[PDB]
Amino acid sequence: GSSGSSGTDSTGIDLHEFLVNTLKKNPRDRMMLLKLEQEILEFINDNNNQFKKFPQMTSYHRMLLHRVAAYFGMDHNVDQTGKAVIINKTSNTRIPEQRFSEHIKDEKNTEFQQRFILSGPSSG
C-alpha cells in the first residue's frame, strides 16, 4: 500500500544542478523560472498575504514550480481537486545562496512592462 518516507535519506539530487542545467539546455525556459522567482519574492516578503494560489498549470509547469519552492524552502499543497497549486509562507522559507539574475547578468534586451497590459480573465 505505502512505505518509505523522507528521513534516513535527505542529501541526494542537488536541486541547483537541475536548475542550472535547465538554464543552459533550455535557455528559453529561464524566462519563466525568472518570472515566478520575482512573484515568489514579493510574496514571501509580503506579510499581509499568508497564502498564494497559482493559476491552472500544465504537467510540466507544475513540476518546474514545485522545484523552485523546494529550493527556496517552501511547502506546496494541492486543492480539493489539485488542478491548481497553492503555496504558503513559512519560516523555513529563506533566500538561497545565489539568484538566477546573477547568471543572466549584463543582458542585452528585456521586455518588462506593467502598463495597459492584462493577463486574460476567463468567465465560467
Curated annotation (Swiss-Prot):
Domain R3H: from-to ranges: 30-93
UniProt subcellular location: Nucleus
Protein name (database record): R3H domain-containing protein 2
Annotated gene: R3HDM2
Range within the parent protein: 147 to 257 of 976
